[PDB]
């Protein structure tokens, strides 16, 4: 599913991401925009053989099992394919574990490089939330 900007903002808010660990909703929408272009089916392979999955591009080296990342952990205890659903629940629940592990949203490279320190509230402007 390719989410609209306000549609995704509303779904993220319903799933408890607004101000989760101090990150306002706009940070999460901005991160999703630049990680996946709001596409739940996005996948991208990394140089170490791991793959990033879903709207928030969660990495198989640590967070999910895709059966093809040797020596990897599955800290969210999910198959990576669950992160590609039109239902963002699995992605949100796993993102909450990631953002809580000490490094905050810096775990998302696109957030650090394209959202951090910008007016992220612009990403939810005009939305009925
Ligand atoms: Cl915001
Ligand atoms: Cl933080
Ligand atoms: Na894994």
CA atoms of 50 and 64, how far apart (whole Å): 10
**Is 113 buried (19+), middle (13-18) or exposed (0-12) by CB count in 10 A?**
exposed
- The set of catalytic residues is 35, 52
CA of 96 to the centre of ligand 1 (A): 17
- 101 labelled ligand-binding: yes
User: Would you say domain 1-129 falls under CATH 1.10.530.10?
Assistant: yes
CA atoms of 2 and 15, how far apart (whole Å): 18
CA atoms of 73 and 115, how far apart (whole Å): 28
**Which of the ligands is closest to the CA of residue 98?**
2
Ion ligand 1 — residues with CB < 5 Å: 24-26, 121
Nearest to 24 by CA among 38, 34, 13, 39: 13
CA of 93 to the centre of ligand 3 (A): 16
Cβ atoms 70, 48 nearer than 8 A: no
């Amino acid at each position: 599913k390719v989410f609209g900007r306000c549609e995704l903002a509303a779904a993220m808010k319903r799933h408890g991401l607004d101000n989760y660990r101090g990150y306002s909703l706009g940070n999460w929408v901005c991160a999703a925009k630049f990680e996946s272009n709001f596409n739940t089916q996005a996948t991208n392979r990394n140089t170490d053989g791991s793959t990033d999955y879903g709207i928030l591009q969660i990495n198989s080296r640590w967070w999910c099992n895709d059966g093809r990342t040797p020596g990897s952990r599955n800290l969210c205890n999910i198959p990576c394919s669950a992160l590609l659903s039109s239902d963002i629940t699995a992605s949100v629940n796993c993102a909450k574990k990631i953002v809580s592990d000490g490094n905050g949203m810096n775990a998302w490279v696109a957030w650090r490089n394209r959202c951090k320190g910008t007016d992220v509230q612009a990403w939810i402007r005009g939305c009925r939330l």
